Design a protein around this ligand. Sequence first.
Ligand SMILES: N[C@@H](CCSC[C@H]1O[C@@H](n2cnc3c(=O)[nH]cnc32)[C@H](O)[C@@H]1O)C(=O)O
Ligand SMILES: [Zn+2]
Length: 404
Amino acid sequence: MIIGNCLILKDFSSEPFWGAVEIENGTIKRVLQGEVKVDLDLSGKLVMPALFNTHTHAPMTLLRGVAEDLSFEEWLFSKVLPIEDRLTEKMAYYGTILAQMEMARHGIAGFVDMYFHEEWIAKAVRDFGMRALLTRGLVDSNGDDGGRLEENLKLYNEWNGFEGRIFVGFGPHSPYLCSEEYLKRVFDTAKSLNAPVTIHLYETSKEEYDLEDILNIGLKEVKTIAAHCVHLPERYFGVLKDIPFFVSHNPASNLKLGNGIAPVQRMIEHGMKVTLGTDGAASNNSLNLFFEMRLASLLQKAQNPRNLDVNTCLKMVTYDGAQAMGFKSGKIEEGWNADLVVIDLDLPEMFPVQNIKNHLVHAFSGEVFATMVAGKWIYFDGEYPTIDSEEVKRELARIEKELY
Ligand SMILES: N[C@@H](CCSC[C@H]1O[C@@H](n2cnc3c(=O)[nH]cnc32)[C@H](O)[C@@H]1O)C(=O)O
Ligand SMILES: [Zn+2]
């Protein structure tokens, strides 16, 4: 298949050019320049690498807007947890289908999850078409984790590697919901399977523990996606530079729950790898990485308008995200995955045409035209080709009634 005859943004550091792309068996076979015979003419649009959301809680789409005007502790222990006790396996599946519908209309190809009923979440990702690094949220009480780590291993056993689209990791919630001993066990497990770890790190100001207790139990050796890092002491930026440590920046969530602004510019200048996550729909409340990217840039610019320039931003949502997720995506080059998104250039916000890249970061709403994952269209002109929209919608309607 060859799509094109339009502008093509190869990667974050290059400029658009008129051409086309040939996809074959979920990969990029070749990138053509100039005019050429295409099977799909996307003239008047832009083709670029798809985006990768490095942090979310998929089924929380079912709780969108249910927890407003609350401090962090109230939000989680008073509002969210009681509702989650009522969230079923079936709801996890449909909440994830909904989450993918939303992420897909925003050009997202893959996401990193941390939740429960994870196998049902995996089924939903299987059916929808996206890529995902799935992990089970882990917490313990003096070593007793209620069988959560075991569930994570079951998930690993049954889903790691599925169709090259799904990978399984471990999700210890945070250094405060996980005891020191339990955390070491989780890191040792991940270390043994050579699997990633995702954890909420220094999300709130109350967290003042030393990163040393983690740096010497596996962090230096385990690929880790640390969400938030709002209060990560700057004295550690140096050491985090050369280990597979990926910060997942979640600007909207940090602001909405009154946690603050992470010094991303500083982290980046110190050589740290930084990616973008949306977190869950109950504390965002959208699953839009374009919005997240724009917001991130603005927040850093408040300190210095030169902070988080356009290319650095595009790199963060595309290539860096794919890297944290272990997928060879993020660039339209031969041999790379065919994970692409199509943006409509025939819009007010995309003018002047000579500044398209800037528009992508500071003016575009995030509503893409189509999104392709593994060579398949998972969203196209308002349509969801991989699912029965109407059926899914009815189920969600029943779930809303049942859940609330
Ligand atoms: N509560 C789960 C274990 C953690 S799953 C991942 C958890 O992260 C929670 N979560 C969602 N958003 C945030 C956030 O912004 N900060 C901290 N935790 C969050 C989410 O509600 C979920 O409970 C259980 O009992 O098995
Ligand atoms: Zn989170």
